[PDB]
Design a protein around this ligand. Structure first.
Ligand SMILES: NC(=O)c1ccc[n+]([C@@H]2O[C@H](COP(=O)([O-])OP(=O)(O)OC[C@H]3O[C@@H](n4cnc5c(N)ncnc54)[C@H](O)[C@@H]3O)[C@@H](O)[C@H]2O)c1
Ligand SMILES: NC(=O)c1ccc[n+]([C@@H]2O[C@H](COP(=O)([O-])OP(=O)(O)OC[C@H]3O[C@@H](n4cnc5c(N)ncnc54)[C@H](O)[C@@H]3O)[C@@H](O)[C@H]2O)c1
Ligand SMILES: NC(=O)c1ccc[n+]([C@@H]2O[C@H](COP(=O)([O-])OP(=O)(O)OC[C@H]3O[C@@H](n4cnc5c(N)ncnc54)[C@H](O)[C@@H]3O)[C@@H](O)[C@H]2O)c1
Ligand SMILES: NC(=O)c1ccc[n+]([C@@H]2O[C@H](COP(=O)([O-])OP(=O)(O)OC[C@H]3O[C@@H](n4cnc5c(N)ncnc54)[C@H](O)[C@@H]3O)[C@@H](O)[C@H]2O)c1
Lengths: 330, 330, 330, 330
């Protein structure tokens, strides 16, 4: 039928025809995200796909959706915080989401950042920018199969990181609160401290909770090997940025790959002026042994494709009164 | 026994003591390369270990080796272009080398640079510098298991690139003029032209011969995919640098990672002033979709140790009358 | 505390001390499974672990459990059919289970059987038993990386089979009703018929439903490649045994590995006399190109360990009024 | 051109036509091995392709080759023990061979037999025959990623066994007298004795020399784990068959898979009567924890094709004056 798609990305636009054909449906793209202003635009539609910028706070929207026969909120993301479930239940609109879009995409960004820093390519470049094309011992590297990898958390994504590294021959240790037999071939569970002590490469794969805010701080960097490489492609708030920067400057660790940062929402996904970018980012950005990507581990064709198709699939099912995989409503 | 060592790296120095214990021999360390000037320091030595800066022109050195009972010359490296094998023969100096110190060192540089450029991490950084923290579609990436790898030449190193990439799920194609059943679990043989046409990532592993100089030029960039990544951790002269720069500038290929570059001799392995760095490097280094490392793919602990411990071991054998594994002709 | 363990296996007995220590609890093993007769034995216990032979039909058991403070039925299996949930809810006894004990154990049995039949070791043995130590062409094999694998269903177990085979270099196709991004690196989804047509090795990984009873029958064997190898380490009822036997005898397929068979419960896990074993089994047993194991893909140390520990873990939690992973009760 | 072929296998016959087209040459097929009796059939031939049953004793054959312009002798196999290299030299017959036709053929036999015996599939069958369909603890297995593999010798084949096993998650240890950096991602080097002590699965990949005959005897079985699996797809004479049988009978090791056996010449590759089969084979074949295959680890399509297409290719080159890759000394 006709499904409204709000807040389409440049990348989602490229998929529309394929998607229309595959699902035998029409997509109606609207350039802003859904809000009391432009809800009058789903009148001609049977369902709705959202990428909310900011909260759906008012109920004039939640009502007018019900009026037009819409029975679902189809989210093209994992995050649900913009969705007032108070109102959702009230108007009988269920909510679907997209939790798993591509674990390998994030995983591969993690491994990639780790590789580059291990090989010290940025430091070399910094050396070269100043005229130094030597091979000093300080920039000596090592084969990845001589490395121990430490995962904090596993999940779909950590599971994938281990698969990859273990496939290159590295030894992989993980701390976790749940035991999962699936990953045993690829890693060995150990506890938190042995993992911080013995890892050459550490990568974060922990959900953000009040209990894990700042779980990597000054104490942990000191416990880490001085030539270790931290990677955080999980949640910025897991790491104490200042403790990081300091650990970096005092050489208590060797490098870092960050696809997330605390207080990122202020500048990530945005165009901005110098005066708008925070100073901690600028510090990390100026370091040849640091990578920062703007939270784009996810950003592959498959992630983008799946974000559309999984959300559409569920949303159509609930337009037919059929059953949808990824509810979050009862 | 005592084996002399010429012109070690500062990281070669770091292993010395460990090597002495592990072999149970002494290592008379001389900073500068062997010459008529320092040849007499070998008097009290059994065998010799060589890293020649330059051609070994003088003959009075080859005589004096054989007058000191030196029965072989142990290249720590793979090159031979300074050994006058004619003089070696008269003085009955058998000549060993190290051809295989760490294929995976180099394979991993090549993989590492491919993944970084695939994830377009430097293009993201180039944006972030100008205030842009978005995810435009021009920087969308892909999972490695959706890419095709094309190898020109295989060899020890290429074989290793194929193992790793195919272990991450990629299709690996390879062109070679010699068949090796060993590598078929990891790749599929194809014609040169089909490799260029079909490969998303192309990595060169072809020796520099007279018939392979500028093997990749204008014609061949023309034949590649326009989102292709070209990796050269082999020999700079395999690639026509102007053809490459033009191809990059015109977006006829997507990225390149080069550990080696035509005309590098003049500045690789040196400290130099802006004026001494060529203009073709300055262009490449300015491109956020390019990586240049200073021929450091080899540079791991493992390599540095093997450069020493493999030469030593054939040098001690030949001194004891035994078999060396890496004797060399012409 | 003290947890009763009913119907302990010989293998579970070997784990008890380790388990007691790890969980800081006492295990009380009872040789029969739980029944109205011996329920008076959990009086001294705080929870209960079951391996039911046959249905828990009567409620004298379900009551007397409640009387003694027991708040859970802790199953050391996946199957719940013996559990009268009518009565469970009635006595406020929740039910836990063990769905995932070791996917790799089943997966590895599958791969193993497949390998052996591909290499034709049994046919060779049959040849040898008669005095033939030749290498006839009919018993020529091939490298596994020249093979295409077909999975019907994926799941945890199929996912694992693909990982392994793909790691050996084989091409892996799967049909499935759900899309799972996790397995894309290891297989390629295709539809049912292409998979039956193009696979050299096919393995079943489909749950038993009325819709999948006999889904492999005469029609399918005919569609399969004549030199293909079917493996069923899923559910016996998925395959039409007579259609199988016939396909085997007419050489419409080449071999089969079966850890399950229709009407197995009559003899599996049992000691029996010749007159007690069915004729279809005896036929398949007499074929050198057939393996039948008595439903023991699961049977490793890890499966057995996990079956105990996962069921104990949950069961203790519910003894404390804490939360248990694997409920099946509401 | 025309190349004669002597004593092809019936599976060698099957490839002939395909080979002719792929090379664009003829293949004059002669059933029996080259002799003074059939040497004259080569008159109209360019080069020759050899599978000698026996010693090439006569000299008048070597003369007549060189009178027919035959410049080389192309062994399709790896053996040389029937080539009188002395006579080859006078007649200027350069002598090629095939040492590397398919390392993975054999590696995969070795892996296949290890997994079958680890899963104890034959011990289960031995039980099922006697009416027992249970899962006693004496037949419990384990996941491959919990086992340690020990390789005595590496080589092309051993290297392949290490790749596969380490790709399934196992720890691989190897003893060798030569260092190869290439294999370090897949295994870790150790002493001979620590390999025997620590390995759950042991696979031999050591050439039969005078110094390796009965390399595995009573002493060494004594040193192995008592649930160890010994795999010999190398050369029978590496193992003391009586020591092995005694070790099995006494349960000093857990299983063995042998593709090769001391004194096999007398019955491997033949059809024979009970009376002609030795008693040490009869014992082994009776053990459900043993596998004997008739030296067929090599036997894949790929091998058979390479035995022909690698010899052909060096034989055509040498006939055209070009370089052969597998010329042989002594
Ligand atoms: N940068 C990105 O592009 C991006 C995108 C999506 C998700 N993420 C983040 O990456 C993480 C990994 O994703 P996933 O799908 O593999 O995870 P998941 O959410 O599927 O599973 C989380 C896992 O973390 C572990 N864990 C739970 N509590 C923990 C604790 N207190 N301490 C340590 N470990 C704990 C458990 O193993 C659990 O299974 C997510 O939690 C999310 O925060 C990042
Ligand atoms: N960047 C570094 O740090 C570094 C250091 C040392 C060596 N290298 C280079 O890495 C490269 C890969 O090494 P390798 O072990 O594969 O080399 P190798 O010498 O072991 O074999 C190279 C392969 O190239 C193939 N080849 C030959 N002629 C060819 C042609 N005309 N076209 C295509 N292929 C051809 C050969 O079959 C051979 O198998 C080599 O060129 C080596 O010089 C790089
Ligand atoms: N022999 C043994 O030792 C043993 C032990 C446990 C389970 N099993 C069997 O093996 C199977 C695989 O286990 P698992 O944990 O990987 O699976 P699972 O139960 O976790 O998942 C089942 C999967 O099968 C697929 N599927 C569902 N319906 C289908 C249909 N109609 N046609 C084709 N495919 C469909 C889906 O991908 C689904 O995810 C189980 O379903 C079970 O029957 C065997
Ligand atoms: N069963 C079959 O079908 C079949 C067919 C052909 C060959 N093979 C055999 O398979 C075996 C493995 O082949 P490969 O390619 O590894 O052989 P290879 O000749 O390539 O190398 C064998 C390795 O054994 C090592 N070695 C040498 N002396 C040793 C000693 N004293 N102790 C321990 N190790 C030592 C060497 O370092 C060498 O690396 C060989 O013995 C070969 O004869 C079997």
């Amino acid at each position: 039928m006709k499904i409204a798609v709000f807040s389409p990305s440049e990348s989602e636009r490229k998929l529309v025809a394929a998607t229309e054909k595959k699902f035998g449906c029409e997509l109606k793209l609207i350039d802003e995200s859904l809000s009391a202003e432009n809800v009058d635009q789903v009148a001609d539609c049977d369902g709705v796909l959202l990428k909310p910028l900011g909260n759906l706070d008012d109920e004039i929207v939640y009502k007018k959706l019900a009026d037009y026969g819409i029975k679902s909120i189809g989210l093209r993301i994992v995050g649900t915080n913009t969705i007032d479930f108070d109102l959702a239940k009230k108007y009988h609109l269920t909510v679907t989401n997209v939790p798993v879009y591509s674990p390998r995409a994030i995983a591969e960004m993690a491994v990639t950042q780790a590789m580059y820093l291990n090989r010290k390519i940025g430091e070399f470049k910094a050396n070269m920018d100043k005229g130094d094309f030597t091979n000093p011992d300080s920039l000596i590297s090592n084969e990845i199969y001589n490395k121990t990898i430490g995962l904090i958390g596993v999940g779909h994504i950590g599971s994938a990181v281990a698969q990859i590294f273990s496939a290159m021959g590295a030894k992989v240790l993980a701390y976790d609160v749940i035991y999962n037999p699936e990953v045993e071939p690829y890693l060995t569970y150990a506890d938190f401290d042995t993992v911080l002590k013995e890892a050459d490469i550490i990568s974060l794969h922990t959900p953000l909770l009040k209990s894990t805010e700042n779980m990597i701080g000054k104490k942990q960097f000191a416990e880490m090997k001085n030539d270790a490489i931290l990677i955080n492609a999980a949640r910025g708030e897991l790491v104490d940025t200042a403790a990081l920067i300091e650990a970096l400057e005092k050489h208590e660790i060797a490098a870092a790959g960050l696809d997330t940062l605390a207080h990122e929402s202020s500048y990530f996904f945005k165009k901005v002026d110098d005066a708008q970018i925070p100073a901690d980012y600028k510090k990390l950005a100026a370091m040849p042994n640091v990578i920062v990507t703007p939270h784009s581990a996810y950003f592959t064709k498959t992630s983008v494709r799946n974000m559309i198709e999984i959300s559409l699939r569920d949303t159509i099912a609930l337009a037919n009164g059929e059953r949808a995989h990824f509810v979050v409503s009862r």
